[PDB]
């Protein structure tokens, strides 16, 4: 009935490579989020304006990449040429992008709260 398939079901080298590069970019962005959280502690301490603007710049770069990735991933999850593995992969990618975007937005708010 529904394509259950076997247990090795990537089915496309192009999409697999794209998803792998996306996962590595997500790891890099989450690590940058951790670093920026430490620097936000530093900014609560010091109220340095240059550090404030720099953190905001990196946050914006990450947020723009993540918004583009989110739109792309939602479109790809709106494909009909999809199998079960691909459908769940796209849904999980969308959801994890939502989480990382919300974390980035909250950190942006917290960092904007300081007087600088």
């Amino acid at each position: 009935l529904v394509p259950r398939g076997s247990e090795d079901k990537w089915r496309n080298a192009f999409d697999h490579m794209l998803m792998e590069e996306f996962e590595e970019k997500m790891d890099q962005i989450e690590h940058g989020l951790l670093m920026l959280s430490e620097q936000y502690k530093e900014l609560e301490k010091t109220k340095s304006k240059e550090l404030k603007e720099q953190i905001l710049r990196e946050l914006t770069i990450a947020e723009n990449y993540l918004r583009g990735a989110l739109k792309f991933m939602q479109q790809e999850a709106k494909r009909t040429d999809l199998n079960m593995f691909e459908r769940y992969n796209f849904e999980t990618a969308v959801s994890t992008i939502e989480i990382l975007v919300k974390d980035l937005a909250e950190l942006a708010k917290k960092v904007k709260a300081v007087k600088s």
């Binding site: 009935l1 529904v2 259950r4 398939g5 076997s6 247990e7 079901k9 996962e23 997500m26 790891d27 989450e30 079960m84 593995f85 769940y88 849904e91 999980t92 990618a93 959801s95 994890t96 989480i99 990382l100 974390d103």
Partner: protein
Amino acid sequence: LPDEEKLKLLDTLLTMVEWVKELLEESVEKNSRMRHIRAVMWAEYMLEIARSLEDEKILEIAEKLEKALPEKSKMFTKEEYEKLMEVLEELEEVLEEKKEEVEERIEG
């Protein structure tokens, strides 16, 4: 569910169990919180599918699995990951038993 659609669901479930084990292994190796989150989400999807079988032992092991999953964005500790793999092997055992039992039922 007729036994045939139960068998189809059991095949899907068994395949997703191995997929989730593989993703847990990859997330532990790469030591990334996002990979953890992805694996936990795959597990949640598998649980949502598994609950539709309305099998008592399947629901019990699904509850155990939900207990073995971390909270939200939190990564799973080492013992928690080992417990997760344990519960996943247990779920694989009961799913294989139910697949066998359904295949026996369809034969008559």
